[PDB]
Design a protein around this nucleic acid. Structure first.
Ligand SMILES: [K+]
Ligand SMILES: [K+]
Ligand SMILES: [K+]
Ligand SMILES: [K+]
Ligand SMILES: [K+]
Ligand SMILES: [K+]
Ligand SMILES: [K+]
Ligand SMILES: [K+]
Ligand SMILES: [K+]
Ligand SMILES: [K+]
Ligand SMILES: [K+]
Ligand SMILES: [K+]
Ligand SMILES: [K+]
Ligand SMILES: [Mg+2]
Ligand SMILES: [Mg+2]
Length: 1327
RNA sequence: GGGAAUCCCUUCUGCAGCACCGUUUUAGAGCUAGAAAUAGCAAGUUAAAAUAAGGCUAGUCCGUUAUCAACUUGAAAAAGUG
DNA sequence: CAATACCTGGTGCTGTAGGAGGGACTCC
DNA sequence: ACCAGGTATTG
């Protein structure tokens, strides 16, 4: 018995089919287990497994790290209280106890209900004096009086609990605070550098202009408008824009060639400045430095909006300013509404449901919603002008704890904390002794390279300790081995050398590694001149001279430099032809030039004796990112360099690692030559072997040593998990393997001939970030003129409009937003060649005509017109490098014939790595024996197809698919994959190279474009029967095999199986609901009675459990027999599984039939009467469990009538005539749907509404009626009910809110294919 | 066909370290006329604590990913069954 | 019990290795 | 937004 397997691997489905020699699908009698009167069943060997999407680990990780941070914040507060313990016990022996129980109701409080002072008078007095904590913070910073220890604790604890971010290294307030002073010093530096062209900055209020609550460009324009002979794009204007955070281009200021685009926010600025300082000189370093200082001052003025000379707590002072202006404006606004619009005062200030002030303070109205609600009210009244100004500044009636407080750096809270400590250590000795301890509590962070401070019970931890003792913020440097931990952080993530698996890979920017790369590329260069008979390699001396003259004097070596600065200067060649390199060398000695600029000792870099040292330095610069640790490591070489050079070395850092180890590059030596790999790269006679040739040459010992150096096997699941790909497709892959195992077991452990596999093919925030970055880097204002919300960017044309800066991409013209529907979206490379519909291959233009010819890439004229605009869009990252290269390919010859042939080959031949991994897995599982030559015996051919093959097959032979009808199309795709792949390799066996796993352009283009014509009877004529040319074996009978495919697709019995899964994840909805009298509320803590404290509800059921027992009834507690479904929640699952009987008895059940406990996961299948099926959605809800096997004729009619996806106009007219001749299929389809719904769905109201809706639109165009009949199948689809629209009529979902019936129905346990069943009559349970 | 180093992009998987809000109960004396229901007015911006219940291994650790038909063994892991 | 209608934790930042899609270039 | 299961209100 010979057979093949077809597979369709998706993210939510694995379709499977078994075919025979004649492309038929077998059917078998399968034994049925259980307690029913059915002993066996007929099954077709075709089906599809369905499953919920596999989830990434991201949400779990975010929750885990948030858990850690909550624990550590609690620990900070605990450290502070431990410091305060004894003296607070002297002052108030229950203060911390009152703080701990602040959440409890007075009933459950063991102490007085007023936390700070324990009596109502003192508490009310405190609140009257300090309405916000920031009042107390400012007072404890400024005052000289001894203060109550409890208020000191409250201030310090508030600073420590909410300490602020750590984006800024070093200390703050370094006299970079005043904006006036830094603006004036910038003017000083500018006038020093440009004596002849000075700026009169007198009378310019730099403070108010630069610190204003406005956009960067607006403040730039404001400051420039106060400078007459100055424009915003001049040098001083560019410096001010740099200080404001924009992206100025200093090219035009200095008449440069290199585009000196500078942004202080980017990571490259430090080099971007230095690079710029190369051309203009070092005299301008002070200018850009003053600009950087001014930028710091403006950033601080964003947060501190108060004069810093009246208080040492400007942050708390700014919060108090918020409070005071809120109070004044609230009084004024209340008076306004009292006098003018009194009929609205109650709604504004009493209705929490409304987004007024009441809903803003007491309800759920945010600052934005409150502004939106009150802006028209302020506009409607008189005297609200300053209020509307404050509102449009987003600075009206502000709270202190707000979303934007994320700006506040931790150093400001630290300054306030340090000031309070300095004030109050004069009166409390323990504050003086523990000042730095508290400061350290605030400042200390666990470094990212250290990880969790575990002690052997964390699978995530890598930290190593110097000494075995409890880690605290104060003993961290002594207990934690930061060096070993930071090294393990990297070395656990980095690959070893694959050639030498025990050797660590070199740093990417290692000098030796770059030498290796440069020589490896330079060895394959060839050159010709006039007198030369044949192109020649570069000799060792030639390569060394090129390295010394060009690679060690320029960061990049171009081909022009090679021709002129070497072949002309040294070899005296006026003309030379170069091969092996184009435009410029890819490899370069970048680290060499970095270190040459830093240390300024070329002889030091060139001396081989220092090699090791330099390597180690680069290692330190690559392995570590903490500047203190880098300094500590470089300290061993302090004697070799000046302190200035040592500082500059500290600041330089590298990221990334190579692919080869030092021992491979320059360690192992060929036995006879005694030469390393790099030695051969530098000089190898006239053979000039590169790395690949060197390690594969049988006349050298490199290959032998590599084989010798090679060295536990993964499980199937482990191997699949370690694949690179989405976890969803990995779930699909493992399910595919299990399906194949079961199918082989079905066929009596006989392995198939072939296995044909095909693998299927927030974000608006990403788009808005893309466009913001591109426009601000571009310097455009299209966002000013056209505000847009991230959701709108999901329209393709508008997103393209913004990525193109509102311009045509083929014509140097502006485009109109309001006319986007009149424009075109065009593919850069035509979709007839590259089926690419991403934004990467798409372009918004006024007319696609202006592209040029439609058979190729945009013409040369358009490229010459628009290359500059495209390069600007590329530098703004609004288009990618690939998009730019495809747009500009016409200047490089456009599309060659080889390119089109390759595009069609790509359309047909699968090349994704993950599909190859699936093929390898199946192949290594199926083929395990070796022959006489010890070569693998490939009994099973693993073929991989792309979806376009079977899609075109369906569209060419009218085997159409409609995904909304049911789930049968996955199984049908698997069947068609099996058939098409088997026939394709039977017809052309040589194609086994391309399609089977294991080891002229016009001609190939023609061949691949017409590879599937042997199925056709006439082309653009061919025999009916199609055979193999050499074997003479028949591969396709066009008179009988298409009928076989049609009959297979018409079979109504298809094994659709929904994978039953225990639910995991969160216990319930995260919302912390207010108190409520309901047993649904769940306590957030053991003693927090939800009736008093609120809590959660809506828990997730891990799985239900069938319980057959007795429950007490009535006041008499009489035992009554019951059979019911109990949903074990995810939170209850461990307790239930530890002891099921005790768990159930705690719920109330008595005399539980232990052996009759059935574990029912989600989607458990039950059959009732008339084949009606239900799936377990929960313990108290059901899902639809049946498939609607709509006959093939109705499916094809619906495909054709709805214009689902053309062909010849004669064929189009024939299909149209078929539709119009079979219009009665509409009523027939509605009849099929109605019979199915009355038998199985059981939604009387929805079915009647649907019948009325269909009878209402019977005069509608056939296209529309068919398109909405497509929607109608949501009523009948398998799974959870959902709402659907028939035209404008909306049908809400009918839900099955009871599970009582399945307790007496037939439970069906299905194998992974559903061919093996166990049926349990549940009516025989309970009595 | 498969594979490797380098260059330019683009993207995704795993991990660690942090910040800001939100919510929840309590605290921040509401007043006056009424017996009351209620009416009129005042007021509001802040804090504490929790942020998966919790666990033992007690760490400044772990607690939401992956994996799961039934049945027979078997504590499990596992093998087997049509 | 049925029809119905609501509801559903969110944002921002730093560091890091690896695989893999597209295009070059040299090779096994 | 999604889905789609939990929940209270209504009857
Ligand atoms: K009490
Ligand atoms: K001006
Ligand atoms: K609010
Ligand atoms: K490693
Ligand atoms: K190049
Ligand atoms: K580094
Ligand atoms: K020195
Ligand atoms: K799971
Ligand atoms: K899930
Ligand atoms: K209150
Ligand atoms: K199953
Ligand atoms: K990442
Ligand atoms: K990457
Ligand atoms: Mg906790
Ligand atoms: Mg808060």
């Amino acid at each position: 018995k010979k057979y093949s397997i077809g597979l369709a691997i998706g993210t939510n489905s694995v379709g499977w089919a078994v075919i025979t020699d004649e492309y038929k699908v077998p059917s078998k009698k399968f034994k049925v287990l259980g307690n029913t009167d059915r002993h066996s069943i007929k099954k077709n060997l075709i089906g599809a497994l369905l499953f919920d999407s596999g989830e990434t680990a991201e949400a779990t990780r975010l929750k885990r790290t948030a858990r850690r941070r909550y624990t550590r914040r609690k620990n900070r507060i605990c450290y502070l209280q431990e410091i305060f313990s004894n003296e607070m016990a002297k002052v108030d022996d229950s203060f911390f106890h009152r703080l701990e129980e602040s959440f409890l109701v007075e009933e459950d409080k063991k102490h007085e209900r007023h936390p700070i002072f324990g009596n109502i008078v003192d508490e009310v007095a405190y609140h009257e004096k300090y309405p916000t904590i920031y009042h107390l913070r400012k007072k404890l910073v400024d005052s000289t009086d001894k203060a109550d220890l409890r208020l000191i604790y409250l201030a310090l604890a508030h600073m420590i609990k909410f300490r602020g971010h750590f984006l800024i290294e070093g200390d703050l307030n370094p006299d970079n605070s005043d904006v006036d002073k830094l603006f004036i010093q910038l003017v000083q530096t500018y006038n020093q550098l440009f004596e002849e062209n000075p700026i009169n900055a007198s009378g310019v209020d730099a403070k108010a202009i630069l610190s204003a609550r406005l956009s960067k460009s607006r403040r730039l324009e404001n400051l420039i408008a106060q400078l007459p002979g100055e424009k915003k794009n001049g040098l001083f204007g560019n410096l001010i824009a740099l200080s404001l955070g924009l992206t100025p281009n200093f090219k035009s200021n200095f008449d440069l060639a290199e585009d000196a685009k500078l942004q202080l926010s980017k990571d490259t600025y430090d080099d971007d400045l230095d690079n710029l300082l190369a051309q203009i000189g070092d005299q301008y370093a002070d200018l850009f430095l003053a600009a950087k200082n001014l930028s710091d001052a403006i950033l601080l003025s964003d947060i501190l909006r108060v004069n810093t000379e009246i208080t040492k707590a400007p942050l708390s002072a700014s919060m108090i300013k918020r409070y005071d202006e809120h109070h004044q404006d609230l009084t004024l606004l209340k008076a306004l509404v009292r006098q003018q619009l009194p009929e609205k005062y109650k709604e504004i200030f009493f209705d929490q449901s409304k987004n007024g002030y009441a809903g803003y303070i007491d309800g759920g109205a945010s600052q934005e919603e409150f502004y939106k609600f009150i802006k028209p009210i302020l506009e409607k009244m008189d005297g609200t002008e300053e209020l509307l100004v404050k509102l449009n500044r987003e600075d009206l009636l502000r709270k202190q704890r707000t979303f934007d407080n994320g700006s506040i750096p931790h150093q400001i809270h630290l300054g306030e904390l340090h000031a309070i400590l300095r004030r109050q250590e004069d009166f409390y000795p323990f504050l003086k002794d523990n000042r730095e301890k508290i400061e350290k509590i605030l400042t200390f962070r666990i470094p990212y390279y250290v990880g969790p401070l575990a002690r052997g019970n964390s699978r995530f931890a890598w930290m190593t300790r110097k000494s075995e003792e409890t880690i605290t913020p104060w003993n961290f440097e002594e207990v934690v081995d930061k060096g070993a931990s930071a090294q393990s952080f990297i070395e656990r993530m980095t690959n070893f050398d694959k050639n030498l698996p025990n050797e660590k890979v070199l740093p990417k920017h290692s000098l030796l590694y770059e030498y290796f790369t440069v020589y490896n590329e330079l060895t394959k260069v060839k050159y010709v001149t006039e007198g030369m008979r044949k192109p020649a390699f570069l000799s060792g001396e030639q390569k060394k001279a090129i390295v010394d003259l060009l690679f060690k004097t320029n960061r990049k070596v171009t081909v022009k430099q090679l021709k002129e600065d070497y072949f002309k200067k040294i070899e005296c060649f006026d003309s030379v032809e170069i091969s092996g390199v184009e435009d410029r060398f890819n490899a370069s000695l970048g680290t060499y030039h970095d270190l040459l600029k830093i240390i300024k000792d070329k002889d030091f870099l060139d001396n081989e004796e220092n090699e090791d040292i330099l390597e180690d330095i680069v290692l330190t610069l690559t392995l570590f990112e903490d500047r203190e640790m880098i300094e500590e490591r470089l300290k061993t070489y302090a004697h070799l360099f000046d302190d200035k050079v040592m500082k500059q070395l500290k600041r330089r850092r590298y990221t990334g690692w190579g692919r080869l180890s030092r021992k491979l590059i320059n360690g192992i030596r060929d036995k006879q030559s005694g030469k390393t790999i790099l030695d051969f790269l530098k000089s190898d006679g006239f053979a000039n072997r590169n790395f690949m040739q060197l390690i594969h040459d049988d006349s050298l010992t490199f290959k032998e040593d590599i084989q010798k150096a090679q060295v536990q096997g993964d499980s199937l699941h482990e191997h699949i998990a370690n694949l690179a790909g989405s976890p969803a497709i990995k779930k699909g892959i493992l399910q595919t393997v299990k399906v194949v195992d079961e199918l082989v077991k079905v066929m009596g452990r006989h392995k198939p001939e072939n296995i044909v596999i095909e693998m299927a093919r927030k974000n608006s925030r990403e788009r808005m970030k893309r466009i913001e970055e591109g426009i601000k880097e571009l310097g455009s204002q299209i966002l000013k003129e056209h505000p847009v919300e991230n959701t709108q960017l999901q329209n393709e044309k508008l997103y393209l409009y913004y990525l193109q800066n509102g311009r045509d991409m083929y014509v140097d013209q502006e485009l109109d937003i309001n006319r986007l529907s009149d424009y075109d979206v065009d593919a850069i490379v035509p979709q007839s060649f590259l089926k690419d519909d991403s934004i990467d291959n798409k372009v918004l233009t006024r007319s696609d005509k202006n592209r040029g010819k439609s058979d190729n890439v945009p013409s040369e004229e358009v490229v010459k017109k628009m290359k500059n605009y495209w390069r600007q869009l590329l530098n703004a990252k609004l288009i990618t490098q690939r998009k730019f290269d495809n747009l500009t390919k016409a200047e490089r010859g456009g599309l060659s014939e080889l390119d089109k042939a390759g595009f069609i080959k790509r359309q047909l031949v699968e090349t994704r790595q993950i599909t190859k991994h699936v093929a390898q897995i199946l192949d290594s599982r199926m083929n395990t024996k070796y022959d006489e030559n010890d070569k693998l015996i490939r009994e099973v051919k693993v073929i991989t197809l792309k979806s376009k093959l079977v899609s075109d097959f369906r569209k060419d032979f009218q085997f159409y698919k409609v995904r909304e009808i049911n789930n049968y199309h996955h199984a049908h795709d698997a069947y068609l994959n099996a058939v098409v792949g088997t026939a394709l390799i039977k017809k052309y066996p040589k194609l086994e190279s391309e399609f089977v796993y294991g080891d002229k352009a016009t001609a190939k283009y023609f061949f691949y474009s017409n590879i599937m014509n042997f199925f056709k009877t006439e082309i653009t004529k061919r025999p009916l029967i199609e055979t193999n040319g050499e074997t003479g074996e028949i591969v396709w009978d066009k008179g009988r095999d298409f009928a076989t495919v049609r009959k297979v697709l018409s079979m109504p019995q298809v094994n659709i199986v929904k994978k039953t899964e225990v639910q995991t994840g969160g216990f319930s909805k995260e919302s912390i609901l207010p108190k409520r009298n309901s047993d649904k509320l769940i306590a957030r803590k053991k003693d927090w009675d939800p009736k008093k404290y609120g809590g959660f509800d809506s828990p997730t059921v891990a799985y239900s459990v069938l319980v057959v027992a007795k429950v007490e009834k009535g006041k008499s507690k009489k035992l009554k027999s019951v059979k019911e479904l109990l949903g074990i929640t995810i939170m209850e699952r461990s307790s239930f599984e530890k002891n099921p009987i005790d768990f159930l008895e705690a719920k109330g059940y008595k005399e539980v039939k232990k052996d009759l406990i059935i574990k029912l996961p989600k989607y458990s299948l039950f059959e009732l009467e008339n084949g009606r099926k239900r799936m377990l959605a929960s313990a108290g809800e059901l899902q639809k469990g049946n498939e609607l096997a709509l006959p093939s004729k109705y499916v094809n009619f619906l495909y054709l009538a709805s214009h689902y996806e053309k062909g010849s106009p004669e064929d189009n007219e024939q299909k149209q005539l078929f539709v119009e001749q079979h219009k009665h299929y509409l009523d027939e389809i509605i009849e099929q749907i109605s019979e199915f719904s009355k038998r199985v769905i059981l939604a009387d109201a929805n079915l009647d509404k649907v019948l009325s809706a269909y009878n209402k639109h019977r005069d509608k165009p056939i296209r529309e009626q068919a398109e909405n009949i497509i929607h109608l199948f949501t009523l009948t689809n398998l799974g959870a009910p959902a709402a659907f629209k028939y035209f404008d009529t909306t049908i809400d979902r009918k839900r099955y809110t009871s599970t009582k019936e399945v307790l007496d129905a037939t439970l069906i346990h299905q194998s992974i294919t559903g061919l093996y069943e166990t049926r349990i009559d549940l009516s025989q349970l309970g009595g």
